[PDB]
Amino acid sequence: DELNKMQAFIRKEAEEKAKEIQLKADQEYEIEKTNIVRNETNNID
Amino acid sequence: IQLQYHSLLLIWLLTFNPVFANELVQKYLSDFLDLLKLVKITIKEKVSRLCISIILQCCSTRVKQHKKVIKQLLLLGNALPTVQSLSERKYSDEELRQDISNLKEILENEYQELTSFDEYVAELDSKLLCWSPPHVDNGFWSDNIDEFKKDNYKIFRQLIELLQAKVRNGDVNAKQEKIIIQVALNDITHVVELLPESIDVLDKTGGKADIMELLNHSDSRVKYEALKATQAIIGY
């Protein structure tokens, strides 16, 4: 139905936002991992 | 009228003995509700007094499980509201008025310990729901969300079973059945919106399938409730 199709687009749009937020978290994890390696460098030094 | 009065007098005489009253209490759970309805409908002072005495004897402290019987009567037959309505109404007979006042006091005392949770539990056990104030009360749902999910979501499982039974009974599509189905759908939607963990349990127990089946129901209200539940599930 028209209502179901309209609700499908809204939920699909929220899915893209969730994926974008998840992708941003992955980028943050890589940055945090690099900082951990940098922190370990001082201890290793 | 004379036959009904004689039957009420015989019932009261039997209930005078606590053992017989306790035995008859479990014989017919709707007997108290029927007696209250007859007393409300009948205008005879003697018949009303006999019905009040019979109702009080069942909930009298002499009979076994008096508190439990009074609580069950108040939860099922709405003894407190009927007693409150009778107290407001004026009765010519003084003895009947005193009996009505005593019954109203007993019902108020029983309802003081009881809460909306007890009424909801009784309604779920009786599988009867007619859009109670707790269903439309956001605060009641918010304060009872944890209780619904308690005991491995026992209340959620009971609601899912009731919805499945209504779907099985949806072929009749009676007005009371339709109202019960709509109330169950609203409760399921509330228990899915709040405490989302119950959504997985409902899906496992076939709640989603029941909602989808109800979405094709002929009744407009049932179809709208099922569509709202589906929207709350995965829709916008």
Give the Cα separation of B133 and B201 in Å (integer): 26
Instruction: List the resolution, Å.
Output: 3.3
Q: Which residues contact B201 (CB under 8 A, 6 or more apart)?
A: B153, B156, B157, B160, B207
Cβ contact B195:B236 at 8 Å: no
**CA atoms lying within 13 Å on the CB side of residue B160:** 21
Cβ-defined contact of B227 to A11 (cutoff 8 Å): no
- Experimental approach taken: cryo-EM
B139 close to A (CB below 8 A): no
Q: Which residues of B touch A5 (CB under 8 A)?
A: none
Cβ-defined contact of B236 to A10 (cutoff 8 Å): yes
Domain around B224: 127-236
> Which amino acid, one-letter code, is at B110?
E
Using alpha carbons, list the distances in angstroms from residue B6 to B11, B13, B22, B46: 9, 10, 21, 11
Give the Cα separation of B102 and B13 in Å (integer): 19
* CA-based nearest residue in chain B for residue A14: B236
Selected for mutation to probe chain B from A1, A2, A3 (highest B CB count within 10 Å) is A3
Through-space distance between the first and last CA atoms of chain A, rounded to whole angstroms: 66
